[PDB]
């Protein structure tokens, strides 16, 4: 199977006067490349994909593909939907803008059954010939892709090579790799990056990496090189920021942190997303001070 693994960043989408800041998006991705990141994830949840137009999502994918041209860094484009016909179209459009693969979230709100999840992802996998990484985050979607459904999709469709697990369920990650050790388990939960990698996970799709790409990159590569003492040391050190980056719902804290570090020019969200409370604002600012934040 063709795979996209390693240290990956769920890119924020900076806004300036209500429009997508193309420069800063481009300058932010080059910062990730410069700090050891293996792949970038445009227009995901951390990129506020719910409030982007198809034209804005297509510009962000094109910016990601062009900024990582001539480098080993891949583009794992977010192309998911709770409607299978749309998810197929988003998959085809991401392949056409030059993405090396797609991260397609489980259908949200309409809560499909396991049978429906299988047919949903099977239709996506047979629509394109590029890798497809499953994304299971039940707290946001209301749905859970069972391990049996994940394993069946991995074995029955060739483009599906693994799953992004943001469920806070290390038991399920053992279940996945004990019954299907060839799949690519990817961490979607920054605080438990090392425990997932220590069980055989082959990468992370991080929110923290937006602010500290060098540390998340080093963590992933330490663990993949079986240097668990250094991977756990970085994981322990990132715990405070990994948690505080979820004081409010992602990407509200991480965008606030990028603004506080001067990495973006505006602290603008699109509704229903909003700036955090003064209380959480001070908490993010105070937690950032204990970390060395790389510039441009």
Residues with catalytic annotation? 135, 164
- Whether 150 has a binding-site annotation, put simply, is no
Q: How many residues bind its own copies (CB under 8 A)?
A: 36
> Does residue 27 belong to the site contacting its own copies (CB under 8 A)?
no
Beta bridge partners of 7: 204
Query: Judged by CB under 8 A, does residue 43 bind its own copies?
Result: no
3-state SS, residue 155: helix
Q: How many Cβ atoms are within 10 Å of 31's Cβ, its own excluded?
A: 18
Q: Which stretch binds its own copies (CB under 8 A): 60-68, 69-77, 174-182, 272-280?
A: 272-280
Q: How far apart are CA 284 and CA 270, in angstroms?
A: 20
Please provide the distance, in angstroms rounded to a whole number, between the alpha carbons at the two ends of the chain.
Answer: 35
Q: What angle do CA 254, 201, 243 make, to 5 degrees?
A: 25
Among 16, 51, 200, 237, binds its own copies (CB under 8 A): 51
Q: Distance (Å, rounded) from C-alpha 193 to C-alpha 170?
A: 11
Distance of closest approach, residue 126 Cβ to its own copies, in angstroms: 13
Mask for 66-105, x = binds its own copies (CB under 8 A): ----------------xxxx-------------------x
Shortest Å distance, C-beta 132 to its own copies: 15
- x/- string (CB under 8 A) for its own copies, residues 118-157? -xx--x---------------xxxx---------------
In whole angstroms, what is the distance from residue 83 CA to residue 106 CA? 10
* DSSP sequence for 50-105: GG--HHHHHHHHHHHHHHTTTSS-EEEEE---SSHHHHHHHHHHHHHTT-SEEEEE
* Annotated binding-site residue numbers for pyruvate: 46, 205
Residues that bind its own copies (CB under 8 A): 45, 48, 50-51, 82-85, 105, 107-113, 115-117, 119-120, 123, 139-142, 248-249, 252, 270-274, 276-277
Q: Which residues are annotated as a binding site?
A: 46, 205
């Amino acid at each position: 199977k063709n795979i996209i693994i390693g240290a990956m960043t769920a890119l924020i989408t900076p806004f300036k006067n209500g429009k997508v800041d193309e420069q800063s998006y481009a300058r932010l991705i080059k910062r990730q490349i410069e700090n050891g990141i293996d792949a970038v994830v445009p227009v995901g949840t951390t990129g506020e994909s719910a409030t982007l137009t198809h034209e804005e999502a297509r510009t962000c994918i094109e910016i990601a593909v062009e900024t990582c041209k001539g480098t080993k860094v891949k583009v794992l484009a977010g192309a998911g939907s709770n409607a299978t016909h749309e998810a197929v179209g988003l998959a085809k459009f991401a392949k056409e803008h030059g993405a090396d693969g797609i991260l397609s979230v489980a259908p949200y709100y309409n809560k499909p059954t396991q049978q429906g999840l299988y047919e949903h992802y099977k239709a996506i996998a047979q629509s394109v010939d590029i890798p497809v990484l499953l994304y299971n985050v039940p707290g946001r979607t209301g749905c859970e892709i069972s391990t049996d459904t994940i394993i069946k999709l991995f074995r029955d469709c060739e483009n599906i090579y693994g799953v992004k697990e943001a469920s806070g369920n290390i038991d399920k990650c053992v279940d996945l790799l004990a019954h299907e050790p060839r799949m690519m388990l990817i961490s979607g939960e920054d605080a438990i990056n090392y425990p997932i990698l220590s069980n055989g996970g082959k990468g992370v799709i991080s929110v923290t990496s937006n602010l500290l790409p060098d540390m998340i990159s080093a963590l992933t590569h330490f663990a993949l090189d079986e240097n668990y003492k250094e991977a756990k040391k970085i994981n322990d050190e990132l715990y405070n920021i990994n948690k505080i980056l979820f004081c409010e719902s992602n990407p509200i804290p991480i965008k606030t942190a990028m603004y506080l570090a001067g990495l973006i020019e505006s602290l603008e969200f699109r509704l229903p997303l909003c700036s955090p409370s003064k209380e959480n604002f001070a908490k993010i600012e105070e937690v950032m001070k204990k970390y060395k934040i790389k510039g441009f």
